[PDB]
Design a protein around this ligand. Structure first.
Ligand SMILES: CN1C(=O)N(c2cc(Cl)cc(Cl)c2)C(=O)[C@]12CN(c1ccc(C(=O)O)cn1)C[C@H]2c1ccc(C#N)cc1
Ligand SMILES: [Mg+2]
Length: 182
């Protein structure tokens, strides 16, 4: 039942410090809920480039979500989502960085914008992909459907649309009902 779960998040266009911090609180909430399970976590911030904020090895060593995310700085550039997914698949889901070859791979993508690059995510086909689109750039049904190409299928399971960053707490509340932690 081992799961290696990566958070991949961009808040470049949700400038407000309060909004960006809600992204961080959401990841903290999830990790706290799943501490001392067979889940291991990593997190990657993306904008124009990609930064591993902590890898799986760091999680096992420090296992304190507050400490792991203490030094995160808000990147304010673009939204290179194709590049970011390929980065995670080729750089983060790697055994040298503490990833477990036996584990189920789950990628949680958190974005406030449509992608500013193009490409494919063929490298990520063995990864279960959820995407959360947040805020005013996803108010139209059209903009929401552009996120389907990044997510696993069906989109009704793997694509979540939130109208405000305040709604991450309510998404967390609803996710908790789908797990039972022994
Ligand atoms: C339902 N489901 C779900 O929403 N997510 C999910 C979706 C979002 Cl947007 C964000 C986050 Cl943090 C988790 C998941 O990862 C799962 C699918 N999943 C698995 C686990 C294993 C396998 C497999 O073995 O194939 C497939 N899917 C575990 C389940 C889950 C639910 C709630 C939390 C919390 N808090 C964490 C995980
Ligand atoms: Mg962006």
């Amino acid at each position: 039942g081992n799961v290696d779960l990566v958070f991949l998040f961009d808040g470049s266009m949700s400038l407000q410090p309060d909004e960006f911090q809600k992204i961080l609180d959401f990841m903290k909430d999830v990790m706290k809920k799943l501490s001392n399970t067979s889940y291991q976590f990593a997190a990657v911030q993306f904008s124009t480039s990609y930064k591993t904020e902590f890898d799986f090895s760091d999680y096992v060593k420090r296992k304190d979500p507050d400490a792991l995310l203490k030094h995160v700085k808000h990147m304010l550039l673009l939204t290179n989502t194709f590049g970011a997914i390929n980065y995670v698949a080729t750089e983060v889901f790697r055994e040298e960085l503490g990833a477990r070859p036996d584990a189920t791979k789950v990628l949680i993508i958190i974005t406030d914008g449509e992608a500013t690059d193009s490409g494919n995510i063929d490298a990520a086909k063995d990864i279960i992909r959820y995407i959360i689109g947040i805020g005013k750039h996803f108010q139209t049904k059209e903009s929401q459907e552009t996120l389907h190409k990044f997510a696993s299928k069906p989109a009704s399971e793997f694509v979540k649309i939130l109208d405000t960053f305040e709604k991450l707490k309510d998404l967390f509340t609803e996710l908790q009902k789908k797990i039972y932690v022994i």
